[PDB]
Amino acid sequence: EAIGVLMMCPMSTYLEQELDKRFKLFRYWTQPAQRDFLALQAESIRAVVGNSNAGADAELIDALPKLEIVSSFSVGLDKVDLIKCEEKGVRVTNTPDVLTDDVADLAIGLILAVLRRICECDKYVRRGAWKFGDFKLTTKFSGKRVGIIGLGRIGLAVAERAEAFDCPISYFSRSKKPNTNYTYYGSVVELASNSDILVVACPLTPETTHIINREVIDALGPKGVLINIGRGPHVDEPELVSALVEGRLGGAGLDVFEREPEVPEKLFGLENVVLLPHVGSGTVETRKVMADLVVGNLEAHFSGKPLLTPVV
Template sequence: MENAGVLMTCPMSSYLEAQLQKRFKLFRFWDAPSEPDFLKHNTGSIRAVVGNASCGADSCLIDSLPNLEIVSTYSVGFDKIDLAKCRERGIRVTNTPDVLTDEVADTAIALVLATLRRICVADRFVRSGLWRNGDFELATKFSGKSVGILGLGRIGTAIAKRAEAFGCRISYTARLKKPNNNYKYCSSVVDLAANCQILVVACSLTEETRHIINRQVIDALGPNGILINIGRGSHVDEPELVSALLEGRLGGAGLDVFESEPGVPEQFLGLKNVVLLPHVGSDTVETCRAMADLVIANLEAHFLNKPLLTPVV
């Protein structure tokens, strides 16, 4: 197993990198002065790719690796992996679900509180010395609000449980109605947005969910509504979100993800009713180590011909 070549697509975790180095023949894609030259000289040695939410394995990379057997992503999302190409080639794919559920759900609630209670603006108010000139303006409460969740999977369910603790009424939409809960099911995201004050995006990114938060959804949420996105940036039509915030057609937004990371629409930067995070929803010491361990465990299982722990394909 120590001779198996593993390509790490970009820097992501020093712990993961060290563990891969111990167990496999590790190739670091970002160290290569020329990607074509690197692939020309090493393509036959690489049997596994380790990517993440921003740098996975597209069709070009997969096509360039004739001996590729498995792609193990250091993320729960796998939209940066060409799954169709992997299925065609018989390449296995794994991700890291469950271990980051609590952290991402916590981040969603933190974004709700920061946006409604204007935590970041209040912090700047104190630091700038403005408090000496008068009190900070009133914010909006979270407790008792109606919360709509787009995608009631592991993370969506964890968000719903946390919001329930604040006395919130929960509604959701998903591909299928979920059994064994008391939440209101809405048949479409527009219906969901029209029936909640806070809309949380927590679904997987697919072609069907790309730009699912469009002008119609935003207008259904309305001028007092809040959008929270801890899914993927491409769930949201960003120009429509920007215009809605600038025109007052939406009350505010809390965003951990963006369509062209690390690029962020410049218009967001001057808005006081938007909270911006650098895609850190799962980034705690504990979770990043657990994610790395799961990547390693999947690779070891594959090379030992054992069942994969968290297979996607």
């Protein structure tokens, strides 16, 4: 008797293939009458596969009375109601550690792309402009002060890369890390005031929602650069756009947006931003590992074996 798995959104061709080979795969996003569909399949669905864009909230869990496990194709779990899962005996797994390096790599790539205007330079060459003069001078990365919001796995990986560019490292966390030689700040504003580059690298929770607000942006200031590889709602996005347009923030390298895949179009005209479509973990190598980990958690669950990467 084949096991019903509801995949919430089209997150990975490979994963879809691997789930379809093993389970009774339902693709939620293809159903034209989704609530009708959940009623029809209430007794058949035993697992949900989510990602950072679509998870499992209380209403979905309530709608899936035979739900046993939510396996997320993500390290973050802001789209899963953990409290509710625990309350219902539903297991939750994620994909820890396996995307750390790619996300940290992208932070450094964004830094260089903004400070050295790599994307602008490449556009300049392809329109033939180099034949009429050199590109403007840009900004040195090595030696600049890098502030990091969050010093968990991804924040540490960013720090360790930036140290190789001779960047002094500072960070904010709820509590100081005793383990580290970096400079601890007890305030995001004070951190920002003392950073040339500010990197958002923490999970999204109520508490960290809009952790980059207007006051933080203005403290980072006209010669500072914001790097967001976290989540869009970490930033008060309309205030970020205003600050960029008005010269109050020096630049921004953004992988994530508050209402992605919508990106404020005013940003498209700005040479001091780099805008990416949430590609932090988006490599062939890392997505394969993540997909295999989702499958491996589901196979362990339905075979009575300990889970690989449980959270709840």
